Amino acid sequence: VSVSQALDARLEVGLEQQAELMLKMMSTLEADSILQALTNTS
Amino acid sequence: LVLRDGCMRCDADGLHSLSYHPALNAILAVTSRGTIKVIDGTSGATLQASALSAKPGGQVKCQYISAVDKVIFVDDYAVGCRKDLNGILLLDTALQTPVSKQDDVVQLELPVTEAQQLLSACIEKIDVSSTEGYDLFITQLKDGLKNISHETAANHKVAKWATVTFHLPHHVLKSIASAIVNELKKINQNVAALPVASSVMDRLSYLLPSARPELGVGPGRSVDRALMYSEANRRETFTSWPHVGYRWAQPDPMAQAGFYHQPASSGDDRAMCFTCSVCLVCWEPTDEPWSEHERHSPNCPFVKGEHTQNVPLSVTLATSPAQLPSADGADRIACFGSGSCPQFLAAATKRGKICIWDVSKLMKVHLKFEINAYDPAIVQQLILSGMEVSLDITALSILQQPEHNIPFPCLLAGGLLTYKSRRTLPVLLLYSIKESSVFPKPGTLVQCLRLPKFAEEETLCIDSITPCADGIHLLVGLRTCVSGGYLVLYKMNYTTRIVTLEEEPVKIQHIKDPQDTITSLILLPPDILDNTLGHLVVTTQGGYVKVLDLSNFEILAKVEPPKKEEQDTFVSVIYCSGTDRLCACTKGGELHFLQIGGVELLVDQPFTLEILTSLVELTRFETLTPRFSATVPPCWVEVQQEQQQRRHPQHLHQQHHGDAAQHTRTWKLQTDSNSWDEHVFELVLPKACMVGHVDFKFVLNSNITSVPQIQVTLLKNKAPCPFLEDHKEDILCGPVWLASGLDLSGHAGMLTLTSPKLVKGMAGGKYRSFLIHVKAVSNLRGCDLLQEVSVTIRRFKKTSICKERVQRCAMLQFSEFHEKLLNTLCRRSDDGQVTEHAQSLVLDALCWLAGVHSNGSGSSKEGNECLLSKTRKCLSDIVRVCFFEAGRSIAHKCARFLALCISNGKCEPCQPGFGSVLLKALLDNMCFLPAAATGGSVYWYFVLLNYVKDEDLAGCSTAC
Secondary structure (H helix, E strand, O other): OOOOOOOOOOOOOOOOHHHHHHHHHHHHHHHHHHHHHHHHHO | OEEEEEEEEOOOOOEEEEEEEOOOOEEEEEEOOOEEEEEEOOOOOEEEEEEOOOOOOOOOEEEEEOOOOEEEEEOOOOOOOEEEEOOEEOOOOOOOOOOOOOOOEEEEEEEHHHHHHHHHHHHHOOOOOOOOOHHHHHHHHHHHHHHHHHHOOOOHHHHHHOEEEEEEEHHHHHHHHHHHHHHHHHHOOOOOHHHHHHHHHHHHHHOOOOOOOOOOOOOOOOOOOOHHHEHHHHHHHHHHOOOOOOOOOOHHHHHHOOEEEOOEOOEOOOEEEOOOOOEEOOOOOOOOHHHHHHHHOOOOOOOOOOOOOOEOHHHHHHOOOOOOOOOOOOOOEEEEEOOOOOOEEEEEEOOOEEEEEEOOOOOEEEEEEEOOOOOHHHHHHHHOOOOOEEEEEEEEEEEOOOOOOOOEOEEEEEEEEEEOOOEEEEEEEEEEOOOOOOOOOOOOEEEEEEOOHHHHHOOEEEEEEEEOOOOOEEEEEEEEOOOOEEEEEEEEEOOOOEOEEOOOOOEEEEEOOHHHOEEEEEEEOOOHHHOOOOEEEEEEOOOOEEEEEOOOOEEEEEEOOOEOOOEOOEEEEEEEOOOOEEEEEEOOOEEEEEEEOOOOOOOOOOOOHHHHHHHHHHHOEEEOOOOOEEEOOOOEEEOOHHHHHHHOOHHHHOOOHHHHHHOOEEEEEOOOOOOOOOEEEEEEOOOOOOEEEEEEEEEOOOOOOOOOOEEEEEEEOOOOOHHHHHOOOOEOOOOEEOOOOEOOOOOEEEEEEOOHHHHOOOOOOOOOEEEEEEEEOOOOOOOOOOOEEEEOEEEEOOOOOOOHHHHHHHHHHOHHHHHHHHHHHOOOOOOOOOOHHHHHHHHHHHHHHHHHHHHHOOOOOHHHHHHHHHHHHOHHHHHHHHHHHOOHHHHHHHHHHHHHHHHHHOOOOOOOOHHHHHHHHHHHOHHHHHHOOOHHHHHHHHHHHHHHOOOOHHHHHHHO
8 A cells, every 4th residue: 555665864853754754654645545446446 | 159969878987989980870989998889870879889809908999981981990909890781880790800720719790680581591491400509509599689679679770780699619600501501502492591601601711711721813723612602702813814904804893793713724814603603705895794694694593683602792891800910919009090091001019010901902911010219210310319229109190192103102100219318209200101213112211200399308299190181281299208288280292202291390389288188189171161271179188179270270169078967078079970060978978969050032033034044053953962871671671783783884883874873772672571561761861952852763563453552751850650640740742642653664663752841941951861651551562562662862953143042942932933934934024025945944944843842742732722823824825825836845845834733733622623724725725726836836735635635525526
């Protein structure tokens, strides 16, 4: 369901790493959702 | 004025000398009877009590050296050297000399936890009981653990410092250890007591000189496979290594990796392993030893981290037997001293024999010599005054030049020359140390400097020789063999290949009062009192603690001795660098702790680009310290250095990102312990500075599908679940959810802990230590899902403007600053027009604020509700400008800002739905979607809409 990992290691010294993680999880979740819709039609 | 910050009674018989260990936050207090008490640096609890004596009747002195991280305990006969073993110092066998015969009774000091795995192995798995002396060893182990079990319940820090001692003959101990390791071989499971018993047999091997075989480092000599379970033997195998200049084939990483040098005719760089015997030759400079060991033998138990017979370098260097300065052992040590060269230590006897040891590596003799009283330099000084001549050594110091050939280190000895004309003449002696315009041999006198005439007239002797911090000056302390002594300041000469001294002293101070006679002196670093050659703190004979400036010898402060419940005179003083206070001991055994002692706001100024650049300089972070002191529950272990070698190789291990990885401490849980809840991690920082955030990394169990409710908290160390209830005012960051810091992969996860209370907590520079408590809210139970935990502590970046802290407090505190931040971001600024770069600056500062009171997660949270309210007031405009007019980088930063606001909207009690109003703003802004400039802003617009459309679907249904 997840096709992307490995955030940049300059992000964890920043505070907003959780926000960029939730953005990446957001994109992967919606990609999985649209692909699951296209599969679940058949 | 120096204030008395509390007092406790340490000993009834009195105290003699003090020493401090900053890496463990412990004060070593020596009593008048020769016992050393280990006292915690902030709580003051007595962690360990031990009596140390190589022979009965000797006085004990102790000293810690920071650069080699070693503590040296000196009594009347032996010196030795010992260092840290997983958080503790082994004291009871620190002054133990090797024995001569096999039937001699030897002492073995063993820490509590691996004694417990030894007990569990000997009871539940292993039958030895046909071996002689087994029952007395079992009785000693039981009695030691039962005596410690009362001490462990009082405090965790007292519990981790305790040690089991055995008193058995050497043959009984080696037979029991050999039977245990043979039984652990034939039972053949990975039991943790096998490295312990291998270490016990290794220590018994070092405890007898004739039990050690000669090193077989030569062509044609077979090396025994029994001796290579120790890492030190693997280190001394590489003395004839032909690839010294190789980057990764250095002797230390591959002696660490289990490899040894046994050269043959088929290869000079031939290296096999100790436990799997894979044979590797033809080393190239790019071969990492751990990677090649895993490549050529992946089935090796040492590569897989299983319990082998491997005795590491840490235990061997932490269990070094004591060495007498002379062979006979009936000689008393006159004086000892370690100066500006931290790797060398010298001691002197009463007749003039000086032995110099090197304490960087394992404790060994570097140089031995005897001072001749008829040296022609001394005879020249005797002649210049115009026959039985005797000379006694009173002080010692080893000098190194501060950083074509580099000049050699040198030894300085304080001598008291006696002659009949009976007259006493104090002289200073300069000697050469290092092995090789005639080059002087080691142990030869280089310069004999005569003290000025008042020392001969008042019959004085040299009491203390200590180099200054700059490496240019030196102070000499004089006392009577009635004037109270002298303080003489000298200058070193660096004009030639040997460090010499100028004949005329720079400054001389007379101690006229005999009550002001110097008993102890310490030199402070210049960086403490910068809020000049340095500062000097001296305890007097009358009990006064005086603070002196080193440049002019003027009394800056004076502390009177306390009154007995007659005055209780201060004896010795030490400076605790972790807590920035002075520990001073009395003759009554009491320890007294002494402490040395309108603005333009950038948020109020108009926001141009320079002000915003300054603001984001306040927001910026960096790594904090090389290592913070931290101790563990016994179920958690400190990681080996080998895992860090897997993270970063050896040349990257130092002064590189390996330093960035050893700011992190990797801690692994074992499954044998009964409790998997209420695990408390105390985090003692070496120096206080403002903390932006701390890290919390962890690895989940792979088998479990869903994560149960587990809390992580961060606490202050005010006094060193009901544990959270007693410290509910002591929390900085609130109890956060573990699944919130989970990564997109369920196995790994990174929690960042910070709060507004954390960034506003460092008011007086008082928060020296931190606490982490983890709790699972209620087979795998508690923290047993977490195989691993890792903590990284980071600070703010230092900025050039004055008064950073009050501007940070106004940054977190002002609602109006947040309102003008988002108002200049709305581009509805009454003055000027905001550039897009200035907008990105505003997003960086604003989202730093939002992250701070997002990760705070407290109860009241006026800042969180406040910033969420004014972002709901202007949400359509921020969506419009960032996702339509700006570039995709600023749109990306706004996407992270809004996603973090979605994150903190659930902790905030949130009566209007933040996702609903964000959906309303985006559905207001759909009609401008063809008019957008860049495609990435459209993409992040649609990404935010993708999440927030799940609340009201009909809006995007109609509008989309």
